[PDB]
Amino acid sequence: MIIGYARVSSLDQNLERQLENLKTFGAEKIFTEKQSGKSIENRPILQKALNFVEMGDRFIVESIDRLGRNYNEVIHTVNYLKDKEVQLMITSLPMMNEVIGNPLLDKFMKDLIIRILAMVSEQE
């Protein structure tokens, strides 16, 4: 199943654009949250989305900053999905899921791509 997670910190932001982007990549169920990205500890709706997905599912966000504004916490969340065998897709960067080289190079490059995006998220 393809699942989306949407987040805005306030209603001023274009939530509808975000929802439309998730739909474009085939999100069948979308969990929508109005909260800051500062912490994962204060986001029950993200926690429901993460508990909802199962092995073989796809978990989609518009950008990694929707998951969180904290590098460490974003990495922890991506690791959770990785462990659960749930594919992460980022609509603003659909290139990320393409295979680069052998299984070693690919996992390493994916690690770096996520870390680059997570770093950008916090740096902003």
Q: At closest approach, how far in Å is the CB of 56 from a second copy?
A: 21
Minimum distance from residue 48 beta carbon to a second copy (Å) = 26
Q: Is 9 a catalytic residue?
A: yes
Q: Write the DSSP assignment of the chain as a string of letters.
A: -EEEEEEESSTTS-HHHHHHHHHHTT-SEEEEEES-SS-STT-HHHHHHHHH--TT-EEEESSHHHH-S-HHHHHHHHHHHHHTT-EEEETT-GGGGS--SSHHHHHHHHHHHHHHHHHHHHH-
Residues at the contact surface with a second copy, assessed by CB under 8 A:
63, 71-72, 75, 91-96, 98-113, 115-117, 119-120, 122-124
Q: Which candidate in 9, 10, 36, 39 is catalytic?
A: 9
Shorter beta-carbon distance to a second copy: residue 29 or 112: 112
Q: Which CB sits closer to a second copy, 46 or 78?
A: 78
Q: Known catalytic residues?
A: 9
